[PDB]
């Protein structure tokens, strides 16, 4: 989500 955020990280990727």
Known sequence: ???X
Do not use: E, M
């Open 1 to 3: 989500a955020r990280a």
